[PDB]
Design a protein around this ligand. Structure first.
Ligand code: FMN
Ligand code: FMN
Ligand code: A1H16
Ligand code: A1H16
Ligand code: NA
Ligand code: NA
Lengths: 209, 209
């Protein structure tokens, strides 16, 4: 029940994420363990947030796919900094990740896009994500028309559709407790008596709940 | 299964929130229907996000309680704009709220604070939220000491502990669909052929998914 510095799986917070993520995936009361909230903002400090799915992770960071012309994509292109929240209610656990964002190479975005179901590919060609549209019939009609156009052909990836990778600068591991005296172990890239060395350029510290 | 403009419960998006919130509360597969992700950022555009609990809502906005000296509280005091995400996975629904934030009156914060369990009150006096601390024993020791100090007495609310209210400027209602052709009905305070009048100064529009 205690979450303690001496029982970390790893002092590389990406590997500690992998350990917790695996526990979430193994939990039958968790539906999408890779659902996350992505927080973005304008350069002038106006924040926004939405659910997204994590599509891959490792040393270079946390990957996701979206339309670059969406509201989030205009913010990320103008202000390439973001934060992620993973919340696993049945495990009483939260993971926060903060870092800069860059676009994935076009070739990786093409490969990912053509791995999706064909109906989802056509949906991305239909949708100018976050633009105002008249009604839901507009989507249904254009979808049906593109189904006809792409019968027995490859669906081209929209130029505006692709991926981002968030390179972690801060990773917080949160475990809920009674009385709201939660356990918080927070890794940051970088020594005071409360600051500890992790792997590579990582440091970690406990934060008050 | 369709989420349609002609079947909105209300064109006052606070009342539409109330209708969806009630459905979530009625759903036995949802634990904390009032859990939400709060997104904040610095004036210079560095975003952050964390889970919080909604503690009340109505026409003046969405209320929550926290330590003003925390990381979120320093951002909100310097840059009084935020965004909220509600995600109800078993209902395939998301609600986003964007708006300015101000502090609740001290008298309301006192009333709320003394309605909490006494062990949670003492926990808030223990914790300088988001400050670096040496270890979890530091929390356990100080908690036990304050339990002794406040035996048979009232726990004073910390000066730094209180509430905020987010006054809604934008409210998005999202309903997931097959093929990722989701339904998005977004209310904003304010007419083009795709913009519709709601109650008071509200307008609403459908956004592409
Ligand atoms: C669980 C979940 C996962 C989602 N995953 C994605 C995704 O990977 N990419 C995406 O573009 N939208 C995804 N969405 C939809 C977004 O929440 C959002 O509606 C969309 O990206 C537009 O956001 P924006 O207007 O802030 O740009 C997902 C929604 C849910 C509820
Ligand atoms: C479901 C859930 C609800 C929470 N509710 C609150 C809350 O209402 N107030 C709060 O200060 N922290 C709450 N927390 C803890 C926060 O996620 C976070 O650790 C804390 O507020 C510090 O955030 P900051 O360092 O960004 O300021 C909650 C966490 C979870 C998982
Ligand atoms: C540090 C901290 N302070 C305040 C509150 C607000 O709730 P309350 O006033 O203690 O009920 C919470 C709330 C939590 S944590 C969790 S899991 N579920 C919640 O509702 C918190 O974590
Ligand atoms: C508009 C939009 N584009 C892209 C993706 C990414 O997932 P995929 O590539 O379609 O599997 C999603 C993902 C969703 S929505 C939901 S509920 N669960 C998801 O994983 C999306 O909503
Ligand atoms: Na580095
Ligand atoms: Na107004």
């Amino acid at each position: 029940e205690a979450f303690e510095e001496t029982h970390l799986t790893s002092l590389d917070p990406v590997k500690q994420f992998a350990a917790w993520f695996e526990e979430a995936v193994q939990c039958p009361d968790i539906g999408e363990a890779n659902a996350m909230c992505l927080a973005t903002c304008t350069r002038d400090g106006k924040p926004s947030a939405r659910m997204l799915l994590l599509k891959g992770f490792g040393k270079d960071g946390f990957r996701f796919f979206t339309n670059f012309e969406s509201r989030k994509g205009k913010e990320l292109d103008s202000n390439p900094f973001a934060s992620l929240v993973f919340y696993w209610e049945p495990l009483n656990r939260q993971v926060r990740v903060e870092g800069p964002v860059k676009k994935l190479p076009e070739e990786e975005a093409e490969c990912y896009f053509h791995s999706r179901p064909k109906s989802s590919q056509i949906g991305a060609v239909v949708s100018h994500q976050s633009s105002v549209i008249p009604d839901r019939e507009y989507l249904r009609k254009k979808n049906e028309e593109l189904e006809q156009l792409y019968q027995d052909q490859e669906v081209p990836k929209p130029k505006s559709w692709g991926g981002y990778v968030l390179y972690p600068q801060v990773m917080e591991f949160w475990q809920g407790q009674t009385n709201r005296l939660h356990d918080r172990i927070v890794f940051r890239r970088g020594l005071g008596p409360m600051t500890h060395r992790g792997e590579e350029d990582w440091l970690y510290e406990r934060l008050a709940p």
